[PDB]
Write a protein that binds this ligand. Structure first.
Ligand SMILES: CO[C@H]1O[C@H](COS(=O)(=O)O)[C@@H](O[C@@H]2O[C@@H](C(=O)O)[C@@H](O[C@H]3O[C@H](COS(=O)(=O)O)[C@@H](O[C@@H]4O[C@H](C(=O)O)[C@@H](O[C@H]5O[C@H](COS(=O)(=O)O)[C@@H](O)[C@H](O)[C@H]5NS(=O)(=O)O)[C@H](O)[C@H]4O)[C@H](OS(=O)(=O)O)[C@H]3NS(=O)(=O)O)[C@H](O)[C@H]2OS(=O)(=O)O)[C@H](O)[C@H]1NS(=O)(=O)O
Ligand SMILES: CO[C@H]1O[C@H](COS(=O)(=O)O)[C@@H](O[C@@H]2O[C@@H](C(=O)O)[C@@H](O[C@H]3O[C@H](COS(=O)(=O)O)[C@@H](O[C@@H]4O[C@H](C(=O)O)[C@@H](O[C@H]5O[C@H](COS(=O)(=O)O)[C@@H](O)[C@H](O)[C@H]5NS(=O)(=O)O)[C@H](O)[C@H]4O)[C@H](OS(=O)(=O)O)[C@H]3NS(=O)(=O)O)[C@H](O)[C@H]2OS(=O)(=O)O)[C@H](O)[C@H]1NS(=O)(=O)O
Ligand SMILES: CO[C@H]1O[C@H](COS(=O)(=O)O)[C@@H](O[C@@H]2O[C@@H](C(=O)O)[C@@H](O[C@H]3O[C@H](COS(=O)(=O)O)[C@@H](O[C@@H]4O[C@H](C(=O)O)[C@@H](O[C@H]5O[C@H](COS(=O)(=O)O)[C@@H](O)[C@H](O)[C@H]5NS(=O)(=O)O)[C@H](O)[C@H]4O)[C@H](OS(=O)(=O)O)[C@H]3NS(=O)(=O)O)[C@H](O)[C@H]2OS(=O)(=O)O)[C@H](O)[C@H]1NS(=O)(=O)O
Lengths: 517, 517, 207
């Protein structure tokens, strides 16, 4: 009661090959659903179409979500990681919950009184067996804020199950979170928890300096021929023939290659200048969307592909990018100066542009009378010989995602970026233990529905150790570093304004340093 | 909760060669900026000229400042140090923070209620690596009061960065104090911290009894000659000649010397009797002021120089002195009977008078027709052979200042007096940890802006060990000691008046004891 | 440095030190001689008390990269700052360490106070300005005074009832106790070291 449970550690430590980023924050937990598990469906949320239909449950539990890069790295630390390392991956995590206070608010006569209840507890358990629906990795809100000065409130845990419209099917499951071994904590008690990440590939935080279709020696020809000429060129009567040429420094497009660009699933190309777009509502009609059990879902951000070709910054794939929102940006139909559209153009070297055909394939058998026809390949699954890069990471974006427990998954790297994990950091769930108001003086079999209004607060630390892969570039000229532009501004970037509101002006990725292909 | 954290130690111990001065005080810490980092500029403070333009940040943190001699020495201890020692310097410091109480004030219905929150904490860290802007040593307010009976409130920490008017430049940095490892303290916890000063020169607390230009034997002549006569004296037709004399007891001014007076940067001379000053507003126009990056700043108190010549107490250099304010004296345009202007006249032996030319230099080449011209040297940088004394210390003045981290500094002794340190006592920063009011019962991604109003109090001790340099004067007649004048007064000096208000009547320096040059 | 040597205070707190603020009663009709003292504060940052001073100075002539802004005369040697040694003059170049220009004045550079490298293949004599690369020593405006401006102002007389307060501009200023400065930058094309001359006296022997 009169002794702190922990201290405030919120700094990074660089040990050459690794970096340990600690981050403490203050949280607040209200009582959700008034301590009840309520069944929710698309009909309770005000009904919807069949594509938006759902069936799940709300629970009285809140959960901690530190699955974003800005909860761990400061804008400076991120820049020191982005400009010097070629890859990085997390090694171990260490979550701690302390300095717990369970305040009891009693609203009597318009006058609000908040007093601490020293004997009240909170339950907090971590599902280490992944027996509960994993909700993190869906890019939801409620993360430790990016700025350490502010306090956040803990999001409410709710899960979904199978549905047939707004109804439940036979296999729909109901999970009671009270059926797990929680750990009651009064003020004075603390919660410590450690976790060590499985072996996941380093995140390639570099761009390639060579294009996958220009990996030859521009001074030498090949010893391999290709159909160069099919028709004797002129006379007056040019006829059918067969001429073969050797690929060379002038026919780089016709040369023979060993590899192919990564897979594709074509996207619609919209312009940031609305005057260049067709005047129709194609936000849903012209979108690329997978079909699953009769209902359509937006492929967004979809698999990994370049945003635009050379010199076309104005164009972005309709769904193929991560769009973050500037500070304070609303929720609905916000305009384009209220969001920050990421630019995945550094992978145009290996991955095909999201808004263009993958290739062209012959669709018939040319003959004396039939001539050579060809089609455009919009969707192209992997093939032996393909090579591609994964989506970037974004200091504001997600860190990991749980690889779904299926018996088949190809290249389980999350489409939103990050590290795909089969055993991701577990979900730390926490709620305020109910404290009933004065019960009747005569026995009533009915469950007590009157409770003492309370909420808890306290601090939370999260230490993560990251393994780095230092850059050993033997390049001669200088590289492209991330730098704060030297020009004078009204307010510093990644700093608080004159009202104390912290804001991240732009989305920072990792691909700055270059490397050969 | 029911046990004190420390005791009240507030006395000095003299061990012959050293003195340990302890000083405990009671403080109060309010919540600053309502827990927010706000960007401030000269435009937010109501705009200004270009010379007063700035750009910095306010933080929710307070800081302890015991950088004044009266926080450690009592008027009696200071007199026992000033009358017996020739020099002194600090050796080690020992800061302690205890008996912490975090009261929670709840203003409901005009009636204020203040109750202690036993579970609330405070964060307090000390920047031992000097990674934060060092603010102490700028002679700001908010020191442990001089009288131990009273309680003070802790000042708010805010720093400045580069600016271009009221705007921020590229290099302007933003430091989040929450990004350092603080130490949460509930009531019952205490903060202890030790520090040991680097090797700094003793502060010369003596005056010289010999003038730097009178270090000869007044009975013997020199064996060195000097141009004595240039013109045959009379005839009617006195012509050009060259006569040389030997310096002697009668020509003490023409003798040869080995040393020169300390450096100069001339100041304007104002009289304490306003009837003797020119009738114009020259407070800023006739001031000496350095230019830095296009903007002018007052050289104040400037480098070290004597205040006036012999028998001219009424005159003081415009900026060249430290002006303290009597008790309760206002902030703006207060009159001269409301301040105490220090008298740096005991260094007229080595240092030149602040309000007079340094010397005279030949400005041409005299010849048959051209005659010997000479100029007055107002500003004179150091030269081989110079010797000077540093500014005095003043029981109300500063103790140390951080030597700026530059690659070049000459005689890094602070111009305001004190000990220049490269690693000064670190800044102890402290704030009240935020405690959110009851959050919504539905998740809102927005940071919580409603907090429980609270402030903390408690005691703070600061023990400093000073090394002394005892006086070994072999002088015959009595010296000049600091003494409380024996005449009867209405109220004792350095004592509380009839209303309980402690006041220091005059500024006490150290230079009382004399020593040869 | 991210802080200016004349802005090392706490912008929220005032000082406990006063300074001559007002010398003349402000208005009436007959404003007369007086003495008012104010406390340095967040609004009078220029009048506050400081512990340090900017590095030393030896003023330079300021030329513009746009030749239309310069005086139409041959002052390459006449208007240059140059030390005298044994009867002969030598250009102080690049001279001691000082900032190149103030804020928002990239076009101006001290006449000799900078290192001028030459682009590839650039000739030897009277080559034009697009054939050289003039370095910008502006990152030390925090501690070092601008190479093309006065160091400070000093009182040149003793104001009295009839004589009024005069002041002069300090062009050359040798070191003083309390000064702090930074040394010239290095430049991947510039020199690495220099031999400190074998003399019995040298101050801050940085080249
Ligand atoms: C939409 O359908 C309609 O059009 C398509 C094509 O148009 S499209 O592409 O724009 O959609 C038609 O489909 C194409 O043509 C089909 C067809 O004509 O039946 C069919 O062609 C393939 O098979 C044909 C018959 O082969 S066989 O082995 O079953 O007999 C064939 O044509 C025949 O060629 C042979 C031949 O050249 O050998 C001819 O045989 C003659 O010579 C042989 C050897 O000669 S030799 O000198 O003695 O050595 C003798 O052994 C043989 O006895 C002799 N036969 S004889 O009766 O003339 O005496 C035979 O007569 C020809 O019919 C096609 O080859 S080709 O030679 O015509 O080029 C062969 N395809 S190919 O070789 O790859 O070109 C295919 O289904 C299809 O082929 S395609 O090239 O891909 O287009 C479709 O039939 C038509 N249907 S409709 O809409 O209902 O009218
Ligand atoms: C503002 O500028 C104007 O005024 C200033 C001075 O005034 S001020 O200080 O108030 O501002 C002028 O500047 C001063 O004078 C300059 C000048 O007169 O040219 C110049 O003087 C220095 O140099 C002069 C020439 O030297 S030389 O070596 O280049 O020739 C010199 O005067 C000359 O003296 C020599 C000499 O005495 O030796 C004369 O030579 C004659 O005798 C030599 C030896 O004699 S011997 O008997 O044979 O042995 C013979 O070898 C020689 O053949 C013979 N020459 S002859 O033609 O007469 O036959 C020579 O004639 C004189 O011109 C100065 O010396 S001095 O003797 O005059 O005292 C010498 N400076 S000094 O020795 O230190 O005095 C300087 O720039 C400057 O000097 S100063 O003393 O510091 O003032 C400025 O020129 C003027 N310019 S204006 O505004 O445009 O009108
Ligand atoms: C270019 O040179 C010319 O102008 C400059 C100044 O102009 S400039 O700055 O623009 O270039 C002149 O230089 C300045 O003035 C000089 C001067 O006037 O002689 C001189 O002033 C200093 O010393 C003066 C005399 O001092 S004394 O101790 O030697 O006597 C002094 O003026 C005298 O003031 C005293 C005084 O006020 O005490 C007068 O004494 C009278 O009162 C005394 C006390 O009074 S009391 O009421 O009895 O208590 C009596 O004891 C005394 O008997 C009595 N004398 S009596 O005869 O009137 O009865 C005395 O009369 C005055 O002459 C200057 O003080 S001040 O009071 O005038 O302000 C003193 N400087 S100051 O105190 O700092 O101001 C300096 O060399 C110089 O001073 S300055 O202020 O820096 O400018 C230069 O002389 C002039 N020369 S010229 O070109 O050839 O014409």
């Amino acid at each position: 009661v009169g002794n702190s449970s922990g201290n405030w550690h919120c700094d990074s430590t660089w040990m050459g090959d690794r970096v340990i980023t600690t981050s403490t924050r203050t949280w607040a937990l209200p009582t959700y659903n008034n301590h009840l598990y309520k069944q929710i469906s698309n009909s309770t949320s005000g009904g919807s179409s069949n594509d938006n239909a759902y069936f799940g449950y709300s629970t009285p539990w809140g959960y901690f979500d530190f699955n974003r890069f800005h909860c761990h790295f400061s804008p400076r630390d991120w820049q020191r990681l982005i400009n010097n390392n070629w890859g990085f991956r997390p090694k171990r995590l260490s979550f701690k919950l302390f300095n717990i206070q369970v305040k009891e608010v009693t609203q009597n006569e318009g006058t609000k009184t908040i007093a601490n209840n020293l004997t009240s507890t909170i339950q907090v358990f971590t599902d280490s067996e992944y027996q509960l629906p994993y909700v993190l990795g869906s890019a939801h809100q409620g993360c430790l804020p990016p700025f350490p000065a502010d306090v956040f409130m803990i999001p409410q845990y709710g899960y979904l199950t199978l549905n047939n419209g707004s109804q439940a099917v036979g296999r729909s499951s109901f999970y009671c979170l009270e059926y797990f071994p929680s750990q009651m904590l009064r003020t004075g008690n603390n919660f410590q928890f450690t976790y060590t990440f499985e072996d996941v590939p380093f995140h390639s935080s570099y761009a390639h300096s060579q294009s996958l279709d220009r990996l030859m020696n521009p001074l030498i020809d090949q010893y391999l021929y290709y159909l160069s000429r099919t028709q004797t060129t002129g006379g007056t009567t040019n006829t059918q023939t067969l001429g073969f040429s050797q690929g060379g420094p002038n026919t780089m497009a016709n040369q023979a290659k060993n590899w192919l660009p990564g897979p594709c699933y074509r996207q619609q190309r919209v312009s940031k200048t609305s005057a260049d777009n067709n005047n129709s509502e194609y936000s849903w009609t012209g979108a690329t969307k997978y079909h699953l059990n009769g209902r359509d879902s937006l492929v967004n951000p979809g698999p990994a592909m370049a945003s635009h070709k050379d010199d076309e910054e104005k164009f972005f794939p309709q769904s193929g990018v991560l769009i973050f929102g500037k500070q304070g940006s609303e929720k609905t139909n916000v305009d384009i100066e209220k969001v920050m559209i990421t630019d995945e153009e550094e992978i145009r070297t290996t991955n095909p542009v999201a808004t263009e055909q993958y290739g062209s394939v012959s669709t018939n058998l040319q003959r004396g009378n039939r001539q050579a026809a060809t089609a455009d390949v919009n969707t192209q699954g992997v093939l032996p010989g393909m090579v591609w890069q994964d989506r970037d990471v974004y200091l504001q974006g997600p860190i990991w995602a749980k690889i779904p427990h299926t018996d088949g998954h190809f290249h389980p790297s999350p489409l939103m970026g990050g590290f795909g994990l089969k055993h991701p950091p577990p979900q730390i769930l926490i709620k305020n233990t109910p404290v009933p108001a004065d019960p009747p003086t005569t026995f009533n079999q009915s469950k007590l529905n009157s409770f003492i209004t309370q909420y808890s607060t306290g601090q939370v630390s999260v230490e993560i150790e990251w393994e780095l892969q230092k850059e050993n570039s033997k390049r001669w000229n200088p590289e492209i570093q991330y730098t704060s532009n030297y020009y004078k501004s009204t307010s510093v970037d990644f700093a608080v304004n004159t009202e104390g509101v912290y804001s991240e002006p732009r989305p920072i990725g990792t691909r700055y340093l270059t490397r050969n292909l």
